[PDB]
Amino acid sequence: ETAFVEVVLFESSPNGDYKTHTTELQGRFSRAGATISAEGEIVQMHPLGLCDLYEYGWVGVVKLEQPEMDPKPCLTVLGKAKRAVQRGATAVIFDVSDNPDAVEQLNQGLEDPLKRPVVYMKGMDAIKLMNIVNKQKGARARIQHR
Amino acid sequence: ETAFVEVVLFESSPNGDYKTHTTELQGRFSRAGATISAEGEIVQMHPLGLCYEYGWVGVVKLEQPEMDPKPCLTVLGKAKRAVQRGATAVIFDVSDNPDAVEQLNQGLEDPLKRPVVYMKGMDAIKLMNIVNKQKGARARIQHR
Numbered sequence: 467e468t469a470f471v472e473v474v475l476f477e478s479s480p481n482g483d484y485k486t487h488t489t490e491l492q493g494r495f496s497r498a499g500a501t502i503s504a505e506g507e508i509v510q511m512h513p514l515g516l517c518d519l520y521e522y523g524w525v526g527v528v529k530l531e532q533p534e535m536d537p538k539p540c541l542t543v544l545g546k547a548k549r550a551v552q553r554g555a556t557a558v559i560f561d562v563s564d565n566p567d568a569v570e571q572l573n574q575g576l577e578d579p580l581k582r583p584v585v586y587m588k589g590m591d592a593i594k595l596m597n598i599v600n601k602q603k604g605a606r607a608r609i610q611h612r
Numbered sequence: 613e614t615a616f617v618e619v620v621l622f623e624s625s626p627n628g629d630y631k632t633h634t635t636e637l638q639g640r641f642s643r644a645g646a647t648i649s650a651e652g653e654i655v656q657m658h659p660l661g662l663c664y665e666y667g668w669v670g671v672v673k674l675e676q677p678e679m680d681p682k683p684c685l686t687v688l689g690k691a692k693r694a695v696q697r698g699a700t701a702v703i704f705d706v707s708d709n710p711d712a713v714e715q716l717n718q719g720l721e722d723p724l725k726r727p728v729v730y731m732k733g734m735d736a737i738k739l740m741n742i743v744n745k746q747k748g749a750r751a752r753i754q755h756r
């Protein structure tokens with residue numbers, strides 16, 4: 467199915483209230499990852515980072531590399547996804563704009579699928595995602611399946 | 613519509629890995645707030661406490677209406693103020709004050725952009741049973 471991923475940039479007023487600028491992106495729920503909603507603070511995982519505690523229920527955003535960069539990977543992208551969940555991601559967003567074989571890897575379906583959205587994302591939405599993801603200290607990802 | 617609220621009790625292990633214990637509950641989406649999903653770590657507000665890290669799930673447990681005759685805030689106000697303070701959904705427990713529910717579901721006001729879930733009877737009982745035990749719990753709030 468299709469994921470409607472909203473990305474929130476939040477900034478607190480001096481008296482303790484918050485202001486937002488949200489941004490609405492689109493990916494795809496994968497065969498491997500459950501098709502539910504979610505939400506949490508985004509940690510930007512280096513793809514090699516999955517081979518440092520975080521509080522629980524955060525949303526990993528890995529951008530996958532040009533495939534010749536990792537000839538013998540530490541893990542299959544699916545491995546990377548299920549390890550993040552062990553490490554306590556509530557969710558998972560992959561940028562595949564560099565590795566569209568991820569899509570086959572991810573949509574296998576052979577295994578029992580994760581209980582959590584593993585969502586992939588490419589082209590321009592991946593751009594606007596990283597655009598914002600690098601900008602400020604904390605950004606909260608809302609994922610829905612409306 | 614029925615709010616599927618699911619409550620994680622997380623425990624850190626040797627690896628850095630976590631082990632869970634989900635508790636599967638139910639409520640209603642109120643009309644004061646959007647009918648969508650949400651999650652975040654559960655912060656317990658005292659009802660008079662409306663008078664954090666952005667993205668938290670306020671849980672109020674409302675009380676006998678004769679305990680606070682002149683409220684500093686409507687229950688609607690309470691839900692809106694929590695959203696002002698970065699709440700990303702807001703779950704009340706109307707068990708003791710069932711007139712709140714009318715006030716929430718008036719519809720004169722234009723709705724919040726957040727789940728405003730209410731709850732009662734048994735399912736809140738489990739809910740509060742869990743909030744009071746742990747320090748921190750995730751409220752996944754699921755719109756199916």
Ligand SMILES: [Br-]
Pocket residue numbers: 540541542544545546
């Ligand atoms: Br692997």
